Amino acid sequence: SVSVQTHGESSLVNKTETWLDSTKATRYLMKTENWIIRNPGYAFLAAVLGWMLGSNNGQRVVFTILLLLVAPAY
Amino acid sequence: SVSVQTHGESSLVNKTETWLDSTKATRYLMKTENWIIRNPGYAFLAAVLGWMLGSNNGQRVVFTILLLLVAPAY
Amino acid sequence: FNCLGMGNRDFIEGASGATWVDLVLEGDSCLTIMANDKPTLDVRMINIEASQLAEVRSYCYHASVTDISTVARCPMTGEAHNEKRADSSYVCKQGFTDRGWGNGCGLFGKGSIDTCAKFSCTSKAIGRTIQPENIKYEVGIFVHGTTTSENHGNYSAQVGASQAAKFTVTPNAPSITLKLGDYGEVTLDCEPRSGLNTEAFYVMTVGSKSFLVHREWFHDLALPWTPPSSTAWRNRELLMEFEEAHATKQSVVALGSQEGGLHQALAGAIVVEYSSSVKLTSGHLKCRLKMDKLALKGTTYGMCTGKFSFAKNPADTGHGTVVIELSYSGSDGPCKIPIVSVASLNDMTPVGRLVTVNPFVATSSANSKVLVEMEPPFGDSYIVVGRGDKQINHHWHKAGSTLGKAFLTTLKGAQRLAALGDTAWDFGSIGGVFNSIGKAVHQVFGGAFRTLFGGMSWITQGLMGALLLWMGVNARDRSIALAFLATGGVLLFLATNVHA
Amino acid sequence: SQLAEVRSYCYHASVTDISTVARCPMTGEAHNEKRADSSYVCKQGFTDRGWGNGCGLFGKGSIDTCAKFSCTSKAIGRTIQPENIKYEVGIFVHGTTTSE
Amino acid sequence: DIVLTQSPASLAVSLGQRATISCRASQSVSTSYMHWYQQKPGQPPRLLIYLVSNLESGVPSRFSGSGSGTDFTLNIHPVEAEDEATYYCQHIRELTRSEAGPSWLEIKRADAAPTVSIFPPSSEQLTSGGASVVCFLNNFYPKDINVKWKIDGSERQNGVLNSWTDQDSKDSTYSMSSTLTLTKDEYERHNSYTCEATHKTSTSPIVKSFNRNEC
Amino acid sequence: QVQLMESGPELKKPGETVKISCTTSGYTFTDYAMHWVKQAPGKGLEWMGWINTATGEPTYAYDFKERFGFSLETSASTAFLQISNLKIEDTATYFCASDGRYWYFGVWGAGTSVTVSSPKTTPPSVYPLAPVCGDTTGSMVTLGCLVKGYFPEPVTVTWNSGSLSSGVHTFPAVLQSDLYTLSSSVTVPSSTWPSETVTCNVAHPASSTKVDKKIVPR
Known part of the structure; x- marks a missing residue:
């Protein structure tokens, strides 16, 4: 549809003010943050799954911070 | 914006034909599949990351099939 | 108002023991009650009505740019100020214009400008907030007497026979007592306020049509919105944009109509019409049916002495029962219509039960059509109308044998558990103990768990469930079901419930 | 210079002349006479029937819903030919000059 | 914020002839949300058309009209002596809700x-x-x-x-x-x-x- | 049945206060808001506002604010329009409505005509008007009755106890020093006057004056 699969980004030459540039930073995060605020109860058990498996410490967060970004808009 | 964060789903009572129902199954997959077809070269090295770490077999795919879904639309 | 030819027709098996029962109903579905001494009842919602709706706010989806004004200034001057920042109708924004000695300035590399454009809304959506007392419910109620293909689907006709009734339950008057006439009176005690959640959502008007939206999502909509009264709006800069600044020239351009985006923002919204009072399609209401004064008359009748005929040919209702319409040519009426549902002709023992209890001829007039429904058993059966050699019979077969029907109760029972929340156990009517704790265990389980991570959309909770099924693979003894708790059921079920 | 017309896109539409031909269950397909013209948008479907509405059978149905399509607004694309492309290139050499 | 005016303010036409009122709404895209009121002097009006396609209860089928956005119409093909009155209209969407300078039917x-x-x-x-x-x-x-x-x-x-x-x-x-x-x-x-x-x-x-x- | 009745015609003076009542029937009162619409003396309908009824909340149109009010009584289904500091420009007819929200309403109120003026209740001056030679045209002699300076409305002006309505035109009255002056003309053929009695009967029950005046020839 027209809602998703935007032209962005051209990335050919293009040093200029495009149609939407400064709003491109607000595409995902804010809409995904509005999703995780929409569903806080998920966010509590979300990061729990990272500490469950692998016992490798620092890469357990690699699960969470990536997986917490999966659930919004699938 | 109006493009994302749709009303769907109400999930209160609502046994009826909604505004968009049959098209709700085509929201993510098809647009994410059009993304992975857009970027096949990523899909080759994408699933490689799963076989890299953990040596636990079947859960290595849990990385990929989840991570290959992350990259489309972040 | 009745259960005739409705899309979803569900029944009620009377165990007697009480004259009161607590049942939940819906606009599309029609409940059918069959009990001893109590005739066959129809209970369904016509629609959900609401009387007074307050105006919460509005949203301007479509805007246009008017009177582009940009006041150019020199570098190092700091802020640029256009006189249009006084009025809120003008949309003003800071900025800059890179300057040379060629255009307007004696310095290089920088600049300042104030770009103002008068805001003009071409089209705006409007939302509504629902008050609990204003909610009305039109509940069609019907009892099955002697009926035809006309009067049975007719309301005012059965009101003359007092076999059908309508009414409006509100929080101000949740209890309504209506009389069925010859069959007695029934008392219906509903819960209008608690049937739906009045403050859980709003009513949003997109274009000419209006639609339902969650009120917490209603305020979270990103689009220029409007206060109730008149003028000053917020985030109206979102439908407009800016460009590069060449000398004094910068073009503020407006986004097109977002009406489509609003229709794109609507997915699970229910289409709702209106005239004087809004009529909602899918109903949810908790009512109490008191049958105490509902009874059976005519205990002294007898059988009809004369030939029958088929006014319409038999067919299957698709809900598990078989209805027929009979035109009785005998003049001995009024008389109790002989009829049964039998296994074989050589066996006169009735097996199938009559959906409409005590078939009766209205008047002595010959060729009077009568529509009576029955539920035959599974397998090969027979519809036999009358006794002695003037009976005219029909062969019936129903493949729905209790094996599959046990799942039709089971599977749909879990479907009855889904989407009805904690009210799902109201089908546990005349409950207590099990049915009471069955809702109570799911009460806090409905007030936590599924509702805590609730808001997941389709494959979101469905896909991770398959990954949560892997949590049941890796576990320890006595710890097995711990990671498996929420996985099976309540999660993948509703994912399989709605496919599509 | 010259741009050919590749195609167009109608983003905004309106419904005109809703027509639905109802039929009985077991009749199979429903056919509305509007399927001849391409301006009418037709779709199959069904209406669950009782003895109360239009039919003598239960549980099923067939209908053909046709609505004349009307485009309120449409976008248009254009394809670029290589020879048609022009480039205006300002070239300047610095001699004695003023601010003007 | 919206200005409404109804024309012609006085229309002399014989009974049975169609009367199509040229109208408009200043603040644009009202969707439909436009009505019609018939008022004889010294009386309250009566709502003629709502939804722009639909009559109220008491008003007979001779009343009709169409429009959206700015312009709207009241089309009565069989005008009658009972239709003699001062025609009013009124708007919705934004607020405050206001009417138009009215129009008179006159039988010719x-x-x-x-x-x-x-x-x-x-x-x-x-x-x-x-x-x-x-x-x-x-x-x-x-x-x-x-x-x-x-x-x-x-x-x-x-x-x-x-x-x-x-x-x-x-x-x-x-x-x-x-x-x-x-x-x-x-x-x-x-x-x-x-x-x-x-x-x-x-x-x-x-x-x-x-x-x-x-x- | 839904029918909206209001307080009837009210006689007021500038500087006073009034509460205009709207009594509703056929529905539960708090369930429909009351749309208030003023009808200007120029027969413009000027919308006053709607009161959220639940909740009892008035919503004013800005021009009507702070000197007007919307108050309610739930049990008897009576909506009230309160007005403070009466003004002569407010002389007009007021209306209420049963709210269908964004589509307005299906039922109009009975109406309330407020009269803000500073007169004395006065009997009319009822004058039999003798037609001259130039007043007889085309076999008919036109006769007339001047009703001058009466307060308050209405007046019932008939002719020979209302026996002849044929050529009777009873014309409206306007304001003169807050008094009303109208004239009524009966049209009868020239053979009927002054052969037959023609007497204009002006019944003013507000001032309790029933006046009978017969036109005499000159």
Whole structure:
């Protein structure tokens, strides 16, 4: 549809003010943050799954911070 | 914006034909599949990351099939 | 108002023991009650009505740019100020214009400008907030007497026979007592306020049509919105944009109509019409049916002495029962219509039960059509109308044998558990103990768990469930079901419930 | 210079002349006479029937819903030919000059 | 914020002929949200069209109309004598809710000239100190009309009281009563009294005159 | 049945206060808001506002604010329009409505005509008007009756106890020093006057004056 699969980004030459540039930073995060605020109860058990498996410490967060970004808009 | 964060789903009572129902199954997959077809070269090295770490077999795919879904639309 | 030819027709098996029962109903579905001494009842919602709706706010989806004004200034001057920042109708924004000695300035590399454009809304959506007392419910109620293909689907006709009734339950008057006439009176005690959640959502008007939206999502909509009264709006800069600044020239351009985006923002919204009072399609209401004064008359009748005929040919209702319409040519009426549902002709023992209890001829007039429904058993059966050699019979077969029907109760029972929340156990009517704790265990389980991570959309909770099924693979003894708790059921079920 | 017309896109539409031909269950397909013209948008479907509405059978149905399509607004694309492309290139050499 | 105006403000058309009201709404894209009210003078109106496609209960099927956004219409193909009234409309979407400058239905007939009768003040009023010269203009169509009080050949606009009715129920014409109020001393110091009535029917004003010295 | 009745015609003076009542029937009162619409003396309908009824909340149109009010009584289904500091420009007819929200309403109120003026209740001056020679045109002698300076409305002006309505036109009255002056003309053929009695009967029950005046020839 027209809602998703935007032209962005051209990335050919293009040093200029495009149609939407400064709003491109607000595409995902804010809409995904509005999703995780929409569903806080998920966010509590979300990061729990990272500490469950692998016992490798620092890469357990690699699960969470990536997986917490999966659930919004699938 | 109006493009994302749709009303769907109400999930209160609502046994009826909604505004968009049959098209709700085509929201993510098809647009994410059009993304992975857009970027096949990523899909080759994408699933490689799963076989890299953990040596636990079947859960290595849990990385990929989840991570290959992350990259489309972040 | 009745259960005739409705899309979803569900029944009620009377165990007697009480004259009161607590049942939940819906606009599309029609409940059918069959009990001893109590005739066959129809209970369904016509629609959900609401009387007074307050105006919460509005949203301007479509805007246009008017009177582009940009006041150019020199570098190092700091802020640029256009006189249009006084009025809120003008949309003003800071900025800059890179300057040379060629255009307007004696310095290089920088600049300042104030770009103002008068805001003009071409089209705006409007939302509504629902008050609990204003909610009305039109509940069609019907009892099955002697009926035809006309009067049975007719309301005012059965009101003359007092076999059908309508009414409006509100929080101000949740209890309504209506009389069925010859069959007695029934008392219906509903819960209008608690049937739906009045403050859980709003009513949003997109274009000419209006639609339902969650009120917490209603305020979270990103689009220029409007206060109730008149003028000053917020985030109206979102439908407009800016460009590069060449000398004094910068073009503020407006986004097109977002009406489509609003229709794109609507997915699970229910289409709702209106005239004087809004009529909602899918109903949810908790009512109490008191049958105490509902009874059976005519205990002294007898059988009809004369030939029958088929006014319409038999067919299957698709809900598990078989209805027929009979035109009785005998003049001995009024008389109790002989009829049964039998296994074989050589066996006169009735097996199938009559959906409409005590078939009766209205008047002595010959060729009077009568529509009576029955539920035959599974397998090969027979519809036999009358006794002695003037009976005219029909062969019936129903493949729905209790094996599959046990799942039709089971599977749909879990479907009855889904989407009805904690009210799902109201089908546990005349409950207590099990049915009471069955809702109570799911009460806090409905007030936590599924509702805590609730808001997941389709494959979101469905896909991770398959990954949560892997949590049941890796576990320890006595710890097995711990990671498996929420996985099976309540999660993948509703994912399989709605496919599509 | 010259741009050919590749195609167009109608983003905004309106419904005109809703027509639905109802039929009985077991009749199979429903056919509305509007399927001849391409301006009418037709779709199959069904209406669950009782003895109360239009039919003598239960549980099923067939209908053909046709609505004349009307485009309120449409976008248009254009394809670029290589020879048609022009480039205006300002070239300047610095001699004695003023601010003007 | 929105301005509404309904036209034509007065429409003379025979019964049975279609009347399509040209209308508009200033603040644009109202969606539909436009109505129609028929009001006879001295009464509350009655809602004719809502949803722009749909009647209320009591209003018969002869009322119709269509429109969206700015412009809207009220289309009555079989206009009737019962349709005679002042047509109103009103808007929704934004607030505050306001109406339009209304439009009158008038049933068309042949143009009629007024019956002009100018009565000298009664002897009872003279003894009361005042004198009111009345001029009755009856059964004239259309409503466009003018009265001029010529005293001794000179027009006087002082003390002129003009009371005219609306379109009649029986013959559907208009009736007017003009009144020239003076004091008896001012009445007896002026001789010729006449009210000339010009109308679209008569190319010359209808002159009914009397003098105090005459009878 | 849904029918909206209001307080009837009200006689007021500038500087006073009034509460205009709207009594509703056929529905539960708090369930429909009351749309208030003023009808200007120029027959413009000027919308006053709607009161959220639940909740009892008035919503004013800005021009009507702070000197007007919307108050309610739930049990008897009576909506009230309160007005403070009466003004002569407010003389007009007021209306209420049963709210269908964004589509307005299906039922109009009965209407309330407020009259803000500073007169004395007065009997009319009823004058039999003798037609002159120039007043007899086309076989008919027009007769007339001047009704001058009466307060308050209405007045019932008939002719020979209302026996002859044929050529009778009873014209409206306007304001003169807050008094009303109208005239009524009966049209009868020339053979009927002064051969037959023609008497204009002006019944003013507000001032309790029934006046009978017969036109005499000159």
